[PDB]
Design a protein around this motif. Sequence first.
Motif, PDB file in Angstrom:
ATOM      1  N   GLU A   1     -40.373 129.229  91.611  1.00 56.69           N
ATOM      2  CA  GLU A   1     -39.520 128.312  92.385  1.00 56.69           C
ATOM      3  C   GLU A   1     -38.219 127.934  91.245  1.00 56.69           C
ATOM      4  O   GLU A   1     -37.135 128.011  91.677  1.00 56.69           O
ATOM      5  CB  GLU A   1     -40.165 127.010  92.603  1.00 56.69           C
ATOM      6  N   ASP A   2     -38.592 127.853  90.097  1.00 59.61           N
ATOM      7  CA  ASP A   2     -37.492 127.647  89.016  1.00 59.61           C
ATOM      8  C   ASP A   2     -36.420 128.914  89.003  1.00 59.61           C
ATOM      9  O   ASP A   2     -35.361 128.715  89.107  1.00 59.61           O
ATOM     10  CB  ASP A   2     -38.017 127.697  87.556  1.00 59.61           C
ATOM     11  N   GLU A   3     -36.935 129.958  89.002  1.00 59.23           N
ATOM     12  CA  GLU A   3     -36.277 131.357  88.997  1.00 59.23           C
ATOM     13  C   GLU A   3     -35.471 131.519  90.314  1.00 59.23           C
ATOM     14  O   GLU A   3     -34.641 132.306  90.198  1.00 59.23           O
ATOM     15  CB  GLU A   3     -37.284 132.639  88.861  1.00 59.23           C
ATOM     16  N   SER A   4     -36.162 130.851  91.590  1.00 54.44           N
ATOM     17  CA  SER A   4     -35.194 130.991  92.744  1.00 54.44           C
ATOM     18  C   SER A   4     -33.827 130.369  92.677  1.00 54.44           C
ATOM     19  O   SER A   4     -33.181 130.570  92.912  1.00 54.44           O
ATOM     20  CB  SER A   4     -36.104 130.706  93.877  1.00 54.44           C
ATOM     21  N   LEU A   5     -33.990 129.044  92.102  1.00 51.29           N
ATOM     22  CA  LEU A   5     -32.828 128.016  91.828  1.00 51.29           C
ATOM     23  C   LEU A   5     -31.851 128.768  90.842  1.00 51.29           C
ATOM     24  O   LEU A   5     -30.751 128.703  91.253  1.00 51.29           O
ATOM     25  CB  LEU A   5     -33.332 126.677  91.455  1.00 51.29           C
TER      26      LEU A   5
ATOM     27  N   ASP B   1     -38.645 117.946  94.988  1.00 51.78           N
ATOM     28  CA  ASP B   1     -39.811 118.633  95.007  1.00 51.78           C
ATOM     29  C   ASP B   1     -40.488 118.413  93.628  1.00 51.78           C
ATOM     30  O   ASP B   1     -41.564 118.124  93.708  1.00 51.78           O
ATOM     31  CB  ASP B   1     -39.684 120.370  95.244  1.00 51.78           C
ATOM     32  N   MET B   2     -39.878 118.637  92.790  1.00 45.69           N
ATOM     33  CA  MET B   2     -40.377 118.515  91.159  1.00 45.69           C
ATOM     34  C   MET B   2     -40.636 117.111  90.937  1.00 45.69           C
ATOM     35  O   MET B   2     -41.327 116.613  89.868  1.00 45.69           O
ATOM     36  CB  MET B   2     -39.534 119.142  90.202  1.00 45.69           C
TER      37      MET B   2
ATOM     38  N   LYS C   1     -43.866 110.395  82.946  1.00 45.19           N
ATOM     39  CA  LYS C   1     -45.150 109.846  82.572  1.00 45.19           C
ATOM     40  C   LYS C   1     -46.229 111.193  82.390  1.00 45.19           C
ATOM     41  O   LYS C   1     -46.653 111.264  81.208  1.00 45.19           O
ATOM     42  CB  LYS C   1     -45.734 108.893  83.523  1.00 45.19           C
ATOM     43  N   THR C   2     -46.178 112.070  83.476  1.00 49.54           N
ATOM     44  CA  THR C   2     -47.285 112.702  83.630  1.00 49.54           C
ATOM     45  C   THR C   2     -47.484 114.139  82.623  1.00 49.54           C
ATOM     46  O   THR C   2     -48.467 114.394  81.771  1.00 49.54           O
ATOM     47  CB  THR C   2     -47.770 113.208  85.084  1.00 49.54           C
ATOM     48  N   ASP C   3     -46.377 114.902  82.784  1.00 51.21           N
ATOM     49  CA  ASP C   3     -46.168 116.367  82.215  1.00 51.21           C
ATOM     50  C   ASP C   3     -44.695 116.448  81.712  1.00 51.21           C
ATOM     51  O   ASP C   3     -43.707 116.919  82.265  1.00 51.21           O
ATOM     52  CB  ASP C   3     -46.350 117.348  83.178  1.00 51.21           C
ATOM     53  N   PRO C   4     -44.396 116.027  80.268  1.00 53.50           N
ATOM     54  CA  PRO C   4     -43.139 116.162  79.511  1.00 53.50           C
ATOM     55  C   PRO C   4     -42.689 117.350  79.561  1.00 53.50           C
ATOM     56  O   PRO C   4     -41.512 117.668  79.360  1.00 53.50           O
ATOM     57  CB  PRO C   4     -43.308 115.554  78.401  1.00 53.50           C
ATOM     58  N   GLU C   5     -43.627 118.607  79.089  1.00 51.86           N
ATOM     59  CA  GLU C   5     -43.091 120.004  78.903  1.00 51.86           C
ATOM     60  C   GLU C   5     -42.560 120.594  80.080  1.00 51.86           C
ATOM     61  O   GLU C   5     -41.422 121.234  80.052  1.00 51.86           O
ATOM     62  CB  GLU C   5     -44.214 120.991  78.410  1.00 51.86           C
TER      63      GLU C   5
ATOM     64  N   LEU D   1     -35.359 119.679  84.092  1.00 52.06           N
ATOM     65  CA  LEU D   1     -34.237 118.861  83.665  1.00 52.06           C
ATOM     66  C   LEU D   1     -33.240 119.749  83.172  1.00 52.06           C
ATOM     67  O   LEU D   1     -31.886 119.927  83.624  1.00 52.06           O
ATOM     68  CB  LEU D   1     -34.256 117.809  82.724  1.00 52.06           C
ATOM     69  N   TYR D   2     -33.465 120.984  82.498  1.00 56.62           N
ATOM     70  CA  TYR D   2     -32.511 121.850  81.877  1.00 56.62           C
ATOM     71  C   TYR D   2     -31.948 122.570  83.127  1.00 56.62           C
ATOM     72  O   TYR D   2     -30.667 123.036  83.082  1.00 56.62           O
ATOM     73  CB  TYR D   2     -33.231 122.911  80.944  1.00 56.62           C
TER      74      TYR D   2
END
Length: 520
Positions: A391-395, A435-436, A443-447, A453-454
């Motif tokens: 999904e990241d790669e599609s954007l 979506d993200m 809070k839940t998943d910082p990595e 965000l990038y």
Amino acid sequence: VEKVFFVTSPIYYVNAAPHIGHVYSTLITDVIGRYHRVKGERVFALTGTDEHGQKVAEAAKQKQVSPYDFTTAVAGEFKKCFEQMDYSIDYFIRTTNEQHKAVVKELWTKLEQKGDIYLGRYEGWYSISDESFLTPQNITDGVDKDGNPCKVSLESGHVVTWVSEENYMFRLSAFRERLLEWYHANPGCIVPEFRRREVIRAVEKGLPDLSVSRARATLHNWAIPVPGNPDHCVYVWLDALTNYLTGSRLRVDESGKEVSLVDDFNELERFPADVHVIGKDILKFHAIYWPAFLLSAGLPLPKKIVAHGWWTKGNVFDPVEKAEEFGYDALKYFLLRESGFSDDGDYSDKNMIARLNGELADTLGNLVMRCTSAKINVNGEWPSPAAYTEEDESLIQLIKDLPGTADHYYLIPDIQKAIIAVFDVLRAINAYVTDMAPWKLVKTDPERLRTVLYITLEGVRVTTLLLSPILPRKSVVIFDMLGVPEVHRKGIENFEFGAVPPGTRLGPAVEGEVLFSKRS
Ligand code: MET
């Protein structure tokens, strides 16, 4: 092959004050110029005033003022209008300028020496308001200024008058085959395509010779004398079209005043125009007459003529009034987004607000706030991304493809389509953020947030870069908020994804700053 990118607006008649049509034409000229500067090219953008001719002289007679004072005053109103609208035009040309007259005489003489100007008569119709020669098929019945039967133009609806003068004649008929060769060989030379087809049909039909002088008396002596014949004046359109040649030869100082007129156009590497922006009202003059003069003079022909959908010249629409109410960049966005190459546009306050709120605030504005927010971007920097999902790669793919897509649109030029393309990506970026849900990810998943965000920051940067010719002030605000180094705000190198490295700190916040405030 590499030269200065020469873009022009038409030069506007000074018979009345600045208004939307002039503002639009110059806005288009400005945006194209801005795009090529952002691309990193050399640019000379030209605009100006068409100051000679019968109708200007008559407009000055009515105001009980000498033509010199009237034109100088109105030119000042045009200059003020364009400073106020925040354009970045390189030079403002006036046909009263002596160097312009020098060039007109020089061109006239060239045409005469080639055997393309002879002494004849024009007997036929004329529209003083359009300074245009018309055949009987282009007139019909209508109403005078008082209200009597009279003849009007099918073109514009302005009053026509019959003319029987002995005039200098340009052999336009001799240039029919050559003009048709030109259009066919260069099928992108006139945009949009249906206007290209219109011109071709016209030239196919056949071309009469063209009157290029009037008797000095008719013009109220407010025109350029014909070389070696003081009884005649040069036609206001041979005069007016030549501004593009004049502007191509003027060295200009840091403050904007003209300084010097070169002998050979190649010195400044501007001529011929890469783009002539015009209204549809003046297409015949730019696509038929102008190239025919240039062919007669052995001068290079322009690359593109773009004819937009408004005719160039109790229901007021004042650009500066609306820009003061809704914002300058916002109004520019609206004018460029609402219409393509048609008149139809809902230029209403309902629609201006719809696009201000929907596109500029909700799509662009909201997205800038989300990726810079202290709640979401807690370190106030560009994070280094983790591994990318599909999904990241599609954007990311959309963002990478955008520059090439927008470039093609800006070069057509079709500025409406370039905006639409950028905003498609902005919508996609918003969809991805919803979506993200990066607010939960803090809070839940910082990595994971680092990656989301990038991508968001980099998408906002690339879209904002391609929108910077449309929104010149706001793009700077946005880049300041993102903390984008100055060097990264232009140049084709920075069209690439990943040009701003992770660890770049954002610009500081202001206590309650808004980018586009929602109205009503
Ligand atoms: C060479 S562009 C001339 C345009 C013309 N003066 C007009 O205002 O319609």
